[PDB]
Amino acid sequence: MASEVLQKTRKINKTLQTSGGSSVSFDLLAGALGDVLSSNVYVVSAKGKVLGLHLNDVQDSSVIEDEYTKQKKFSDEYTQNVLKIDETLENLNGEKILEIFPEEHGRLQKYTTVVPILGSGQRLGTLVLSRYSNSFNDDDLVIAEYSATVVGLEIL
Amino acid sequence: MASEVLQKTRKINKTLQTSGGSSVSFDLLAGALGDVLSSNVYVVSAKGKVLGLHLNDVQDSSVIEDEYTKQKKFSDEYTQNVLKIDETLENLNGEKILEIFPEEHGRLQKYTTVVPILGSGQRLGTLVLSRYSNSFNDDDLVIAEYSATVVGLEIL
Amino acid sequence: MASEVLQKTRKINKTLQTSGGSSVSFDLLAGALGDVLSSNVYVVSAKGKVLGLHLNDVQDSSVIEDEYTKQKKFSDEYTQNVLKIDETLENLNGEKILEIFPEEHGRLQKYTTVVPILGSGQRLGTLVLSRYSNSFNDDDLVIAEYSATVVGLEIL
Amino acid sequence: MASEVLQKTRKINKTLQTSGGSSVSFDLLAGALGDVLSSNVYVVSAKGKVLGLHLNDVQDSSVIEDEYTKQKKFSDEYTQNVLKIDETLENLNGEKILEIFPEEHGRLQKYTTVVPILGSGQRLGTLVLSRYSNSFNDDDLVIAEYSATVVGLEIL
Amino acid sequence: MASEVLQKTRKINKTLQTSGGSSVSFDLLAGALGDVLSSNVYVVSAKGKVLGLHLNDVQDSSVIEDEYTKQKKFSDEYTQNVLKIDETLENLNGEKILEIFPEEHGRLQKYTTVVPILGSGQRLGTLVLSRYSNSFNDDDLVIAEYSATVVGLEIL
Amino acid sequence: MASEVLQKTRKINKTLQTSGGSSVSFDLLAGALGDVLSSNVYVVSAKGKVLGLHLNDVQDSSVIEDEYTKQKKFSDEYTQNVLKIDETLENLNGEKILEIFPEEHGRLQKYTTVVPILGSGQRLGTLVLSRYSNSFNDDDLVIAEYSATVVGLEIL
Ligand SMILES: CC[C@H](C)[C@H](N)C(=O)O
Ligand SMILES: CC[C@H](C)[C@H](N)C(=O)O
Ligand SMILES: CC[C@H](C)[C@H](N)C(=O)O
Ligand SMILES: CC[C@H](C)[C@H](N)C(=O)O
Ligand SMILES: CC[C@H](C)[C@H](N)C(=O)O
Ligand SMILES: CC[C@H](C)[C@H](N)C(=O)O
């Protein structure tokens, strides 16, 4: 059996070899968006990694922690489904939400907008915004779309 | 009075011009370290921002949220105090803790280690580790000092 | 006296040793702004360098050529005056224009908006937009200010 | 219909999602070469975009502005034709020119040199030099080829 | 025939076009490792380039020079064989060395450790450590593995 | 006293915290230059470190290994003295060599050229080229100077 200090080194190095210990985080942008829009905000990489998060409604989170790697992500199905949206999809509600996010069966009154994140004309991730009561308008789409473009510039 | 959309744009742009809306996070590394050392782990930039966090003992957290900017940080006092430590300070306990972390009245019954984070021989931050019951030993310090070294490689 | 090839090599290398002989250009963004706002657009570094330019009204250009590099720039007075402006100045018209841009003598019926370009809370340049006939509104400011912010992210 | 502000935002974002709205200008280098060679100098990406320009003879420019982006470029013909040259071609004069540059109809007395720009063993671009009266010699080629090689270094 | 200056310019440029005339080196890390492990240390890219080297025992080096690129490297068979090793291989000694390194016939008394270098869960290279007399222990492995991991962070 | 594993980790980390363990080598450019010019070539940072080396005449190397690190450098006297040269110094020979390189007493028949390496208006290092029998001519200087400028661009 490897010595304890070598086993622990190996666990740290697996974490490193996977990620660089270091992740880019758009939590500050997601929070500002969340505040202005009173919304759950997810900044999701194309591979499904949650790079930024703000929860207005903590009970409604679709974030899952990878049991093995501890990395915050969307499910495999959620990850794939958002990539099928190639232009902004606004005000998804109520049963139509299940076409894209099948596990939303208590949350179908919500308005959800999905914004592709593109950098150098490539699909790099997705911005997901969702709230109760009030549909998003075009002013909200301005903010959402330029924020997504900014993420794209920072991940590119 | 500015239109609602211009007011919200200006909020987003304050977040962006400040941070971008981006940050480097060391939560995965802090989690692995916290796991293998059974410790509270804080990766704290030179200016006090908490870039990586793991809480083994959640009630003992010394993180505060900035009112105005929203960021996780140490207090000015804590921020300045950890910069006075220029080499690894291991197993700070019980009343000596108060020199560095004065708000520790109830937890002088812990072992706390402070490790400078250096990159290109410049002080970029500080790694703080704290736990109950067992003092840190030299194997623990190997893990902690190489981890701090890695953080410094990734901020630099 | 050095051979002609060596003299010419030396001149080229002076250019390379200074700059590379490379700069960053925002002409693509300045063109897109200029199109959507029907304006003359200048992206000006803090030191006075015109990094992006679009002319809707070619006759009204304030661009001058640096004697010793042919680099496009603002005059020293224009350069220093725009740095004194620390927030968006919208719809500068007609004679107040002269407080900032003193050589605007047959162009005072123009509307000019001046947007600081900030990155990481630092002043890195300025965006200047000018057009005839129609004042800028708050929607125009949204576009101007988020474009200025993007420049700040790309220079930073 | 999307609101005006949203449509303009979307135009700005297409520019950014594309290019960012940023380029890298070899105008400085082109100018230095243009000066020492008394030449029109074109630094042209593999895809035809004019990244640097100096005009000793302004009437003779082959630059066109893209109808949409307004980006300076060579025609599709000129762009594809320069990629047919895999080694330096010096002193193209006046009937061999029609094979590569067909719309040089009155400029057949000119001496034109085409130098591939190579970097990390890929063809990244082409440097085009042209002047009247004086053929280019091997000293000129030294200057031109190292300059092309440095562009190759700075795109790569 | 090209003038001599041109021909020599073209040789230099072929090196600059290829590599720049630059590599990333890990000699300083290899030297620190070789000192605290009294070992020959090889930092080897997956393609076989020797990026870092320290020789405690100069006569035993396996480094060869590529005739064309000039780069230090391992032989094709050494290169391919270390890539088959997917976990740390500790204390290769005796005849078994020959399964991995077939040219070690005068040197079978040595102990060799082979550590994969991984970066973002991809195989980027290999760390090779070798010495006489003393087997490597677990503390040696800690140092070797975290050093390998840091190479991976720096090549990634 | 700290455990052996901790003391060795601390040595490794001093190397890392310092440089990364990483550095940039100009060995490939130095080899290309020492081949075209049949010369010893040293690419030397402003602080004296040998970044690139080629030896046509191995016995005449002025490289020393740092007593502690073993890092390759010039002596402090050589390091100081090259920075007193602000323009190319060509064909330093025979007793004058000693004003700059005082330890050259068996090597006074050589021709040595010293080229400042400049990048973004700063003195970054020095290129030193040395050979028996033939003085350097202006063509040699072209190659040296442009190669120095390229090192400048790559360190900068
Ligand atoms: C990603 C699906 C939705 C938006 C999420 N469950 C929420 O309501 O926040
Ligand atoms: C930062 C001071 C100490 C470490 C902290 N309160 C803890 O026990 O986690
Ligand atoms: C810089 C001053 C103004 C904006 C400029 N002359 C123009 O009208 O385009
Ligand atoms: C690109 C073709 C030639 C070179 C160009 N029209 C010139 O004379 O400048
Ligand atoms: C790569 C094989 C071994 C390790 C090498 N010959 C040495 O003894 O250093
Ligand atoms: C740096 C001094 C001289 C150049 C060196 N000893 C050589 O002959 O290579």
Side-chain angles (χ1 to χ4, degrees), chain C residues 60-83:
Chain C
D60 294 351
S61 190
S62 288
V63 181
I64 67 174
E65 319 288 306
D66 174 280
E67 326 82 56
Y68 323 95
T69 72
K70 245 48 153 187
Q71 190 140 212
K72 299 179 208 311
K73 75 180 186 177
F74 275 8
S75 66
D76 287 358
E77 190 167 26
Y78 278 30
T79 288
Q80 290 313 306
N81 285 174
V82 294
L83 284 180

mmCIF file of all heavy atoms in Angstrom, chain C residues 60-83:
data_model
loop_
_atom_site.group_PDB
_atom_site.id
_atom_site.type_symbol
_atom_site.label_atom_id
_atom_site.label_comp_id
_atom_site.label_asym_id
_atom_site.label_seq_id
_atom_site.Cartn_x
_atom_site.Cartn_y
_atom_site.Cartn_z
ATOM 1 N N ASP C 60 -14.784 65.323 -41.853
ATOM 2 C CA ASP C 60 -14.802 65.779 -40.449
ATOM 3 C C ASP C 60 -13.758 65.077 -39.556
ATOM 4 O O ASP C 60 -13.690 65.310 -38.310
ATOM 5 C CB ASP C 60 -16.210 65.518 -39.853
ATOM 6 C CG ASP C 60 -17.274 66.373 -40.505
ATOM 7 O OD1 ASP C 60 -16.921 67.302 -41.299
ATOM 8 O OD2 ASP C 60 -18.459 66.115 -40.223
ATOM 9 N N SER C 61 -12.981 64.184 -40.157
ATOM 10 C CA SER C 61 -11.943 63.503 -39.421
ATOM 11 C C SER C 61 -10.999 64.361 -38.604
ATOM 12 O O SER C 61 -10.435 65.351 -39.111
ATOM 13 C CB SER C 61 -11.137 62.543 -40.310
ATOM 14 O OG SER C 61 -10.260 61.717 -39.520
ATOM 15 N N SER C 62 -10.774 63.959 -37.332
ATOM 16 C CA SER C 62 -9.801 64.537 -36.468
ATOM 17 C C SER C 62 -8.497 63.718 -36.404
ATOM 18 O O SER C 62 -7.591 64.095 -35.654
ATOM 19 C CB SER C 62 -10.372 64.775 -35.014
ATOM 20 O OG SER C 62 -11.313 65.844 -34.982
ATOM 21 N N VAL C 63 -8.342 62.678 -37.230
ATOM 22 C CA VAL C 63 -7.148 61.829 -37.223
ATOM 23 C C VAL C 63 -5.979 62.555 -37.824
ATOM 24 O O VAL C 63 -6.150 63.232 -38.882
ATOM 25 C CB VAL C 63 -7.368 60.501 -37.997
ATOM 26 C CG1 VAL C 63 -6.134 59.645 -37.943
ATOM 27 C CG2 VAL C 63 -8.546 59.700 -37.436
ATOM 28 N N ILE C 64 -4.839 62.482 -37.168
ATOM 29 C CA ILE C 64 -3.557 62.985 -37.677
ATOM 30 C C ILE C 64 -2.497 61.872 -37.641
ATOM 31 O O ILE C 64 -2.734 60.826 -37.020
ATOM 32 C CB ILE C 64 -3.144 64.254 -36.949
ATOM 33 C CG1 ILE C 64 -2.812 63.998 -35.492
ATOM 34 C CG2 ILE C 64 -4.200 65.329 -37.142
ATOM 35 C CD1 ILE C 64 -2.277 65.207 -34.813
ATOM 36 N N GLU C 65 -1.398 62.049 -38.391
ATOM 37 C CA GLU C 65 -0.396 60.984 -38.665
ATOM 38 C C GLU C 65 0.836 61.407 -37.910
ATOM 39 O O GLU C 65 1.304 62.503 -38.028
ATOM 40 C CB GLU C 65 -0.002 60.795 -40.156
ATOM 41 C CG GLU C 65 -1.109 60.863 -41.215
ATOM 42 C CD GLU C 65 -2.054 59.670 -41.233
ATOM 43 O OE1 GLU C 65 -1.573 58.515 -41.336
ATOM 44 O OE2 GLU C 65 -3.292 59.900 -41.177
ATOM 45 N N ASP C 66 1.384 60.469 -37.163
ATOM 46 C CA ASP C 66 2.540 60.725 -36.349
ATOM 47 C C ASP C 66 3.704 60.847 -37.330
ATOM 48 O O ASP C 66 3.961 59.978 -38.135
ATOM 49 C CB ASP C 66 2.801 59.603 -35.344
ATOM 50 C CG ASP C 66 4.104 59.797 -34.595
ATOM 51 O OD1 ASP C 66 5.168 59.469 -35.162
ATOM 52 O OD2 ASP C 66 4.071 60.290 -33.448
ATOM 53 N N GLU C 67 4.378 61.967 -37.243
ATOM 54 C CA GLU C 67 5.518 62.315 -38.079
ATOM 55 C C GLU C 67 6.501 61.137 -38.233
ATOM 56 O O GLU C 67 6.817 60.737 -39.357
ATOM 57 C CB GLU C 67 6.205 63.553 -37.474
ATOM 58 C CG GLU C 67 5.239 64.571 -36.801
ATOM 59 C CD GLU C 67 4.799 64.229 -35.357
ATOM 60 O OE1 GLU C 67 5.665 64.047 -34.483
ATOM 61 O OE2 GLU C 67 3.578 64.119 -35.074
ATOM 62 N N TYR C 68 6.918 60.553 -37.103
ATOM 63 C CA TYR C 68 7.988 59.527 -37.061
ATOM 64 C C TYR C 68 7.538 58.049 -37.145
ATOM 65 O O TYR C 68 8.392 57.185 -37.219
ATOM 66 C CB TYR C 68 8.898 59.721 -35.824
ATOM 67 C CG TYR C 68 9.127 61.174 -35.499
ATOM 68 C CD1 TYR C 68 8.323 61.817 -34.550
ATOM 69 C CD2 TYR C 68 10.089 61.930 -36.177
ATOM 70 C CE1 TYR C 68 8.479 63.155 -34.261
ATOM 71 C CE2 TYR C 68 10.249 63.277 -35.893
ATOM 72 C CZ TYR C 68 9.433 63.881 -34.927
ATOM 73 O OH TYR C 68 9.541 65.210 -34.580
ATOM 74 N N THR C 69 6.239 57.740 -37.103
ATOM 75 C CA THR C 69 5.766 56.356 -37.367
ATOM 76 C C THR C 69 4.609 56.198 -38.345
ATOM 77 O O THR C 69 4.294 55.081 -38.738
ATOM 78 C CB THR C 69 5.355 55.664 -36.065
ATOM 79 O OG1 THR C 69 4.126 56.231 -35.590
ATOM 80 C CG2 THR C 69 6.454 55.822 -35.017
ATOM 81 N N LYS C 70 3.977 57.314 -38.714
ATOM 82 C CA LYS C 70 2.760 57.372 -39.534
ATOM 83 C C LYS C 70 1.552 56.755 -38.818
ATOM 84 O O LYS C 70 0.443 56.725 -39.364
ATOM 85 C CB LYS C 70 2.985 56.827 -40.960
ATOM 86 C CG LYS C 70 2.835 57.853 -42.096
ATOM 87 C CD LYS C 70 3.599 59.158 -41.859
ATOM 88 C CE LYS C 70 3.995 59.842 -43.158
ATOM 89 N NZ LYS C 70 4.878 60.996 -42.855
ATOM 90 N N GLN C 71 1.747 56.300 -37.588
ATOM 91 C CA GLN C 71 0.624 55.914 -36.787
ATOM 92 C C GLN C 71 -0.486 56.986 -36.723
ATOM 93 O O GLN C 71 -0.213 58.158 -36.576
ATOM 94 C CB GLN C 71 1.060 55.560 -35.389
ATOM 95 C CG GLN C 71 -0.052 54.928 -34.577
ATOM 96 C CD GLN C 71 0.414 53.768 -33.695
ATOM 97 O OE1 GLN C 71 -0.352 52.824 -33.452
ATOM 98 N NE2 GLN C 71 1.663 53.839 -33.199
ATOM 99 N N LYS C 72 -1.731 56.559 -36.858
ATOM 100 C CA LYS C 72 -2.845 57.402 -36.685
ATOM 101 C C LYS C 72 -3.024 57.747 -35.201
ATOM 102 O O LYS C 72 -2.878 56.867 -34.305
ATOM 103 C CB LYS C 72 -4.074 56.755 -37.245
ATOM 104 C CG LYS C 72 -3.927 56.481 -38.738
ATOM 105 C CD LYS C 72 -5.145 55.803 -39.354
ATOM 106 C CE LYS C 72 -4.745 54.958 -40.568
ATOM 107 N NZ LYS C 72 -3.884 55.719 -41.526
ATOM 108 N N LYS C 73 -3.365 59.005 -34.950
ATOM 109 C CA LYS C 73 -3.521 59.516 -33.570
ATOM 110 C C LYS C 73 -4.410 60.747 -33.490
ATOM 111 O O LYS C 73 -4.822 61.360 -34.536
ATOM 112 C CB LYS C 73 -2.129 59.772 -32.969
ATOM 113 C CG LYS C 73 -1.403 61.016 -33.483
ATOM 114 C CD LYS C 73 -0.027 61.197 -32.833
ATOM 115 C CE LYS C 73 0.615 62.512 -33.254
ATOM 116 N NZ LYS C 73 1.925 62.703 -32.552
ATOM 117 N N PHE C 74 -4.727 61.133 -32.252
ATOM 118 C CA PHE C 74 -5.273 62.417 -31.949
ATOM 119 C C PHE C 74 -4.135 63.337 -31.577
ATOM 120 O O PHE C 74 -3.094 62.907 -31.112
ATOM 121 C CB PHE C 74 -6.326 62.383 -30.820
ATOM 122 C CG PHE C 74 -7.731 62.043 -31.254
ATOM 123 C CD1 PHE C 74 -8.111 61.611 -32.542
ATOM 124 C CD2 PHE C 74 -8.745 62.071 -30.261
ATOM 125 C CE1 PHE C 74 -9.444 61.361 -32.867
ATOM 126 C CE2 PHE C 74 -10.048 61.786 -30.569
ATOM 127 C CZ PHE C 74 -10.419 61.412 -31.867
ATOM 128 N N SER C 75 -4.376 64.636 -31.748
ATOM 129 C CA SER C 75 -3.457 65.640 -31.279
ATOM 130 C C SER C 75 -3.291 65.485 -29.763
ATOM 131 O O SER C 75 -4.150 64.898 -29.079
ATOM 132 C CB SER C 75 -4.046 67.004 -31.545
ATOM 133 O OG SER C 75 -5.212 67.291 -30.821
ATOM 134 N N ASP C 76 -2.250 66.075 -29.265
ATOM 135 C CA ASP C 76 -2.003 66.088 -27.779
ATOM 136 C C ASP C 76 -3.152 66.713 -27.021
ATOM 137 O O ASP C 76 -3.574 66.182 -25.962
ATOM 138 C CB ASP C 76 -0.757 66.855 -27.414
ATOM 139 C CG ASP C 76 0.561 66.118 -27.789
ATOM 140 O OD1 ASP C 76 0.549 64.958 -28.313
ATOM 141 O OD2 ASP C 76 1.645 66.720 -27.523
ATOM 142 N N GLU C 77 -3.707 67.822 -27.532
ATOM 143 C CA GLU C 77 -4.801 68.449 -26.798
ATOM 144 C C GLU C 77 -6.122 67.592 -26.791
ATOM 145 O O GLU C 77 -6.787 67.476 -25.776
ATOM 146 C CB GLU C 77 -5.097 69.829 -27.322
ATOM 147 C CG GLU C 77 -6.062 70.670 -26.496
ATOM 148 C CD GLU C 77 -6.086 72.139 -26.880
ATOM 149 O OE1 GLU C 77 -5.770 72.499 -28.073
ATOM 150 O OE2 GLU C 77 -6.471 72.944 -25.980
ATOM 151 N N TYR C 78 -6.495 67.021 -27.939
ATOM 152 C CA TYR C 78 -7.608 66.158 -28.040
ATOM 153 C C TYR C 78 -7.371 64.917 -27.093
ATOM 154 O O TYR C 78 -8.331 64.440 -26.392
ATOM 155 C CB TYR C 78 -7.870 65.738 -29.460
ATOM 156 C CG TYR C 78 -8.672 66.772 -30.327
ATOM 157 C CD1 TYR C 78 -8.604 68.160 -30.101
ATOM 158 C CD2 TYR C 78 -9.571 66.292 -31.274
ATOM 159 C CE1 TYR C 78 -9.367 69.034 -30.839
ATOM 160 C CE2 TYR C 78 -10.364 67.153 -32.012
ATOM 161 C CZ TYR C 78 -10.236 68.533 -31.806
ATOM 162 O OH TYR C 78 -11.059 69.387 -32.500
ATOM 163 N N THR C 79 -6.179 64.355 -27.166
ATOM 164 C CA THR C 79 -5.804 63.179 -26.399
ATOM 165 C C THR C 79 -5.965 63.430 -24.901
ATOM 166 O O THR C 79 -6.589 62.649 -24.185
ATOM 167 C CB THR C 79 -4.361 62.782 -26.732
ATOM 168 O OG1 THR C 79 -4.314 62.229 -28.061
ATOM 169 C CG2 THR C 79 -3.778 61.703 -25.856
ATOM 170 N N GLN C 80 -5.437 64.521 -24.442
ATOM 171 C CA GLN C 80 -5.466 64.830 -23.011
ATOM 172 C C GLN C 80 -6.832 65.261 -22.635
ATOM 173 O O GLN C 80 -7.265 64.933 -21.523
ATOM 174 C CB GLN C 80 -4.417 65.891 -22.651
ATOM 175 C CG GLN C 80 -2.974 65.383 -22.742
ATOM 176 C CD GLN C 80 -2.733 64.010 -22.048
ATOM 177 O OE1 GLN C 80 -3.045 63.827 -20.844
ATOM 178 N NE2 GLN C 80 -2.193 63.040 -22.810
ATOM 179 N N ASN C 81 -7.554 65.974 -23.514
ATOM 180 C CA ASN C 81 -8.887 66.436 -23.096
ATOM 181 C C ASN C 81 -9.863 65.252 -22.867
ATOM 182 O O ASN C 81 -10.608 65.271 -21.889
ATOM 183 C CB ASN C 81 -9.509 67.474 -24.055
ATOM 184 C CG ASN C 81 -8.899 68.865 -23.947
ATOM 185 O OD1 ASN C 81 -9.274 69.753 -24.783
ATOM 186 N ND2 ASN C 81 -8.001 69.105 -23.027
ATOM 187 N N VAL C 82 -9.844 64.219 -23.711
ATOM 188 C CA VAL C 82 -10.800 63.136 -23.577
ATOM 189 C C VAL C 82 -10.533 62.321 -22.299
ATOM 190 O O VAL C 82 -11.493 61.748 -21.740
ATOM 191 C CB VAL C 82 -10.860 62.158 -24.769
ATOM 192 C CG1 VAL C 82 -11.382 62.859 -25.995
ATOM 193 C CG2 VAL C 82 -9.541 61.445 -25.037
ATOM 194 N N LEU C 83 -9.278 62.252 -21.876
ATOM 195 C CA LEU C 83 -8.917 61.600 -20.607
ATOM 196 C C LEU C 83 -9.427 62.301 -19.408
ATOM 197 O O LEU C 83 -9.480 61.679 -18.341
ATOM 198 C CB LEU C 83 -7.411 61.461 -20.422
ATOM 199 C CG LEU C 83 -6.811 60.348 -21.246
ATOM 200 C CD1 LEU C 83 -5.322 60.331 -20.969
ATOM 201 C CD2 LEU C 83 -7.419 58.923 -21.034
#
